[PDB]
Amino acid sequence: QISVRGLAGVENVTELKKNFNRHLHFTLVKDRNVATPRDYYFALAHTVRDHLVGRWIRTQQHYYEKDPKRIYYLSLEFYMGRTLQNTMVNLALENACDEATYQLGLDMEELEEIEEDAGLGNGGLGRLAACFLDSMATLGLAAYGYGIRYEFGIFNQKICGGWQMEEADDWLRYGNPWEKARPEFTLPVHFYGRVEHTSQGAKWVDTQVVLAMPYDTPVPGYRNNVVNTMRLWSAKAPNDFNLGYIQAVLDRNLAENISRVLYPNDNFFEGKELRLKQEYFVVAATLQDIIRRFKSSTNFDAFPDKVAIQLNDTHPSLAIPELMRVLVDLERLDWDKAWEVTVKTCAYTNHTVLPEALERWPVHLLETLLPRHLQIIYEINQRFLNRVAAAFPGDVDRLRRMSLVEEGAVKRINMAHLCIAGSHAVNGVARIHSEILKKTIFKDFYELEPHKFQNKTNGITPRRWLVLCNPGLAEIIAERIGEEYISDLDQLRKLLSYVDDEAFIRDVAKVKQENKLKFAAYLEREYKVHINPNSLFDVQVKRIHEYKRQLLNCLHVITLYNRIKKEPNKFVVPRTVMIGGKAAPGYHMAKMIIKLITAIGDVVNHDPVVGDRLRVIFLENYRVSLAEKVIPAADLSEQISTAGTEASGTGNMKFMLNGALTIGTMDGANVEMAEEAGEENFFIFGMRVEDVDRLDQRGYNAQEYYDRIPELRQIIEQLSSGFFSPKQPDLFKDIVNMLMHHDRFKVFADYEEYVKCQERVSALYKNPREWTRMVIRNIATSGKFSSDRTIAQYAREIWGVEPSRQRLPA
Amino acid sequence: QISVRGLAGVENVTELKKNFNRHLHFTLVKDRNVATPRDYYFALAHTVRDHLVGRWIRTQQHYYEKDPKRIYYLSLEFYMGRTLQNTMVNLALENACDEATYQLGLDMEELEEIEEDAGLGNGGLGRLAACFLDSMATLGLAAYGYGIRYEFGIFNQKICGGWQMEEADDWLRYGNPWEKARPEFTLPVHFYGRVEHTSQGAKWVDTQVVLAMPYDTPVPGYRNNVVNTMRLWSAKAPNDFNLGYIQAVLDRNLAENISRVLYPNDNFFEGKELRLKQEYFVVAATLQDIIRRFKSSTNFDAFPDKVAIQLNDTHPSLAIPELMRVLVDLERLDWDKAWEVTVKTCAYTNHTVLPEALERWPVHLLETLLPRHLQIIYEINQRFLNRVAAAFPGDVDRLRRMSLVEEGAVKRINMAHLCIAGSHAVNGVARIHSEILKKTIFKDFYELEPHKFQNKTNGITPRRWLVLCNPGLAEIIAERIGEEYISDLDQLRKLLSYVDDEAFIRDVAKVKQENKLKFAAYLEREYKVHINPNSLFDVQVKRIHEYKRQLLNCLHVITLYNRIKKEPNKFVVPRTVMIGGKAAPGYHMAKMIIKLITAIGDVVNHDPVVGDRLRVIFLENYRVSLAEKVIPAADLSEQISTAGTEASGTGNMKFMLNGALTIGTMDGANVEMAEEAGEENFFIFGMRVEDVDRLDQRGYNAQEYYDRIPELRQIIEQLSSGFFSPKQPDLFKDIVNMLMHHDRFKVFADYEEYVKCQERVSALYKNPREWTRMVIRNIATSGKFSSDRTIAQYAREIWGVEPSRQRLPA
Ligand SMILES: COc1ccc(-c2nc([C@@H]3O[C@H](CO)[C@@H](O)[C@H](O)[C@H]3O)n[nH]2)cc1
Ligand SMILES: COc1ccc(-c2nc([C@@H]3O[C@H](CO)[C@@H](O)[C@H](O)[C@H]3O)n[nH]2)cc1
Ligand SMILES: *Cc1c(COP(=O)(O)O)cnc(C)c1O
Ligand SMILES: *Cc1c(COP(=O)(O)O)cnc(C)c1O
């Protein structure tokens, strides 16, 4: 049907049909009389998987023969989502599979909906890792993603009585056709024990052993026949583990719990032993695998020429002392040489400045679990501080600030300090964030070693986030400028020459309208709710956190409601306000915010005076597959974090690419988006970073805003008095008390500017031609935010490898 | 090469090679340059599996269309062993696969050795279930085996310093290509809770739910294109289970532990809650599956016409009250009608008279775990005892003896009594055993309902236990009488006409010699030990238990050793005495017996005066795959249980079929073997059951035998004084004390007759022609001991179905 989905040749379609029927019979052991839609999904997934394997084998063979520098991307999170459609897109099989399944009496879109998300991440950080793997494959880099194969990913969210309930995400229940277990490359990982000092070096002895079993998942590049590997480790007990008899076997679960479940905190550090075990587990297994591959290419001088290790935040920071341990204790390198190799191999990406998100591990935990690593950390620290003292003689407070070891009631190791000391490059994830790192939390380190500090602004893959989720938009773009933009997103600039083209304006608006209709029907089918698809779709989807300011959005929604009730017969631009996202299970305020959003909905959606002019919907179970549906349907993207808090954001970029306008603060990558599109094509409001600093110096007093803004006072009085919770009048007192007395994120300080800016949004929406022209200017300038651009910069400026768009032979 | 392995046609071999290469590439994602022997095994297993699937689908379809009476064989144990070779034998693919792999540069016998045993049983009871599944498929019965998919089967045995050590049997580590998960037919199983009485019936409420997920394994019949199903349940927690957050997810292991591990006790009852959970789990899931299939054929009068449930001992006895629960509480049948249906549906096989093996569950356990089942059991008991009281008025002691409820400090439910009350047929497993049931432990029940009591003598499948393990013997038989005997083992009687045939005598002895050479080399390769293959191979392999009297064998071995040392220059027939088997981990005396056997070996095998005239070998890790190697190599089969203790035995039958002579007591099926072969062709010794009873009446005094038999006194003095344990002189005092003062199995009472009978064995072995003639007379009369005969009797006399040797279309 549409060109960007590829060719459906007679031979190809005939062969797909044959192989589908072969898998249904031989692989699934079903016939057509008893097959369910799930069986049909698996038959198609195996059929498509077969097309990957030849390319996967040949790619890995090619890397063995050419021996390029290898890139290892270490992350505790990979938020992959579904694989079937992405695989078809990257192999140019989508139209062929559509036609094949159509001829078998099946709807391929219905089969796609059966696949579980691989939800092995919390949000942005994990999804960035996934976009990066796609870009690395598309750019022909010899890259490997290494992580943990969690049995349970991010929990499934249910809303009961307006409250979040959590259910385990049993994503492996029906099997995962995309992974290949490799039990033959299983490796041992050590814990506990003690250190003995012999005459020739330290020895780590009396340890408990857990096995790391790898599962490999293919990562196809975009139409280049490159298939890279994501290797995820699963924990297994050895067979003599604890070996009355029955209890010893049952106790194997203690070892296997390491890979059982993803910690569900976004931007928050929980210092639990189990999490530390996960961090070491992934590092120890991965580093053995790296060294094995390096020796099968004595001379570790060449190691940094053949290996780059990228640390996705501090979560895999133990890679630094582990590499030192292996090189010094096992390979018998002198300390100075081992350190040179380590620093040249490792690079660190920081993703947050929030103090509660930074990993600071208690020394007593490390002492018990990883006694040799603690010794190595202390030695790193002493050598590092000796350098500081030589550069800044007499500056004793600098020595305290820069130490890897923090003093206090409980001594802690600051893992960010460890990463900076042990890495040749340290980057933030958007220009403003990288500047904040140099001016504030890592200022001292920047003064010592300015050359280490870089910026790499984040991006998103346009395969998943345009072609896959919004084929209608991809097609109308391709009709004008061809298909090359899918792997060279800067070509979207050519669309600026179509900003006054009446046919293009029409087509852009038509695609948005279709996407809104399709989403409005999805909502009715799966969740029994009636929305007006002519209304402005105002969307805020992301994890629930105080810094992201869903509460500010709530205040605007109540303002609109109160304005309608005051003047019911005045025209207002109709809106559907959709908010979705998961709260971390232990984060009380985030759970209270969810309840507030649903309680506002309960009032607003049932008030007959409001009608269809305002609807408030909480989108349940926000995840990658839901993002693919709602983002193409959005008109307005809410990116309203307090300036200085959102390191980058990536949702922001997904909305820009898909034809929504953005209302946002000058935070993270929003700054760069506005710069690319022009400030006149962005709805910017609120305090800049400098304004927040000025408020913090005099002292934030929320009472001043309450006293001066009557519309704001009315809302607080409604919240306090039980207007949105008549049966439990004090339900929201924690929210009110926080806003009035200990709001770290200054919700009231941006309220007035936010409401005024929202009125400008509504004014523009009344003129559909000018709204759409502004949209075209956004889509046209979104090219910088391709993760292909981001990865090319990492490759050239950090890893020292050249990207390639050349195809391997098929 | 050999005819019974089938045809190797050019087309077949070409297609096998293609499919092997397809699986290596697409299924395993390997090329020939990096493939290991394990990859080659999996490629062949998938290739052979593909030949099963069409037949499996068509067989199950045929049962749906014809709607025959269905047979459900419920067992906690299925000791399957390896599947690859058995599959090839039953599909006539062995020579074709041999040729295909040969042309690919691979040795198929080497690939076969890579497969793990499916070790989901302890010994005879579990292996009987496996032979039965093979026979049911070969006889065209619509039969299903139902059990538990244990993650860990019977432990792997290691010998360290002469002691048994246990290691977990992680049989699923590399995957199981033979099973198909069916997560779509997952069913709930309930535990705990309480009973509420409403106006219309009892309700079992407030229960904890565990899911039962089925995995299906194909069971091919012998060259008839029938493929039946073995369905094994695995335990899964529901997704809301216990739903801080992290701990709730980790605690899912509590539910999933139900299917984690096989209880490793042979002939011993351990009354643990976890075992009770396993028993109910298998019953509750299976019965729902049975009822579903019955309703998809209101009218439960027809249920016993369409369903037979065979209880493999009392382990699945909760099927009786569960069926009553479903019919009364859920289907709303009146009690009397439900009971009629239950009795007509269920039949019970008893496999032991040892009092410590009989299941007697504490009432307090049932009350907490299965409160509704306990109520139903009490009602069954009251109704049953009302019948007893009407038949035997005033016989109050009979009421006490027959009750399902045993009085005492702890009230217990006698599950054997429950099975008899609720079953239309009760059988023992050999003629002597079935007679013992009627005369002793179930005498009262037999007097009430004589019509219920039957015998079904055990058997073994001649596919695994002749064709598969001893192709050389199968072939020389086939050269004379054709191939029909493989599915009609009574045809072996035709071999009596070849007892004086010089060529046949030669060939039988040649095959034995080859098997001994092959086993002698296996021992050198895998376990670094030098045995004389011209020696008589004297073999006792079976679980270690006091009743099986490995200790009596030990006493004979020491006797031979002492006789050699007394007269070193006299000729004695050389022997290699091999003993193997696992001890239950908590069974102290069994572990001490293993240590005694290895300690005897340590002395005997290193005494230079003995030379190669006597060797004592402990065969480590005895299991089904080791049985397939050692049984074809044996000359003498040791079947020496105290009369009245071995309900049947099946090892005995395996040795008879494979050309060993038997030294044995008149116990279990040995009685029937001697009757079939003639007593003159069997080495019978020792007390009969009647002699044991006479000794028990006067009192067994072991001291009398010590005082009268100088050779026996010498052995006890050697054991006591530390001759076999010089560094730990008192090591064997528990063994000595047991033999002298509390030997329940009367080892000393059979010593003299046993040693004299062993001298007759040695005398016959000196005349190889007459030894071999006696062997032919044994093999020729082994036909009764086919499990095809056993299953045909169950079918006709218990299940009410007619067996069929007709082929389904291919
Ligand atoms: C399990 O514990 C944690 C899980 C995640 C984070 C984390 N997530 C991000 C997000 O990273 C994105 C990708 O760079 C940014 O776009 C986003 O601004 C940031 O909040 N920063 N930090 C921190 C601890
Ligand atoms: C896990 O707990 C148990 C496991 C097994 C048994 C058992 N095994 C047999 C053996 O059954 C064989 C098949 O009928 C007989 O040949 C054998 O004589 C008997 O001991 N009888 N009883 C009992 C409890
Ligand atoms: C992109 C994405 C995120 C990150 O969104 P932000 O608005 O940048 O926080 C979180 N979750 C999912 C499922 C995503 O696809
Ligand atoms: C046949 C068999 C048994 C039963 O042997 P008995 O001598 O009858 O106890 C036990 N274990 C294995 C592995 C078997 O094959």
Curated annotation (Swiss-Prot), chains A, B:
Modified residues (N6-(pyridoxal phosphate)lysine): K654
Activity-regulation annotation: Allosterically regulated through the non-covalent binding of metabolites, being activated by AMP and inhibited by ATP, ADP, and glucose-6-phosphate. The activity is also controlled by post-translational modifications including phosphorylation.
UniProt-listed GO biological process terms: glycogen catabolic process
InterPro entries on file: Glycg_phsphrylas, Glyco_trans_35, Pyridoxal_P_attach_site
Modification note: Phosphorylation of Ser-3 converts phosphorylase B (unphosphorylated) to phosphorylase A.
Record-listed E.C. numbers: 2.4.1.1
List of residues binding AMP: D31, Y64, R292, R293, F294, K295, S296, S297
UniProt modified residues of type Phosphoserine: S3, S403, S487, S720, S721
GO cellular component, one term: skeletal muscle myofibril
Site residues, Involved in the association of subunits: C97, C131
Cofactors: pyridoxal 5'-phosphate
Keyword Transcription attached: no
Site for Can be labeled by an AMP analog, residues: Y144
Entries under PROSITE patterns matching the protein: PHOSPHORYLASE
Protein purpose: Allosteric enzyme that catalyzes the rate-limiting step in glycogen catabolism, the phosphorolytic cleavage of glycogen to produce glucose-1-phosphate, and plays a central role in maintaining cellular and organismal glucose homeostasis.
Name listed for the protein in its UniProt record: Glycogen phosphorylase, muscle form
Source organism (scientific name): Oryctolagus cuniculus
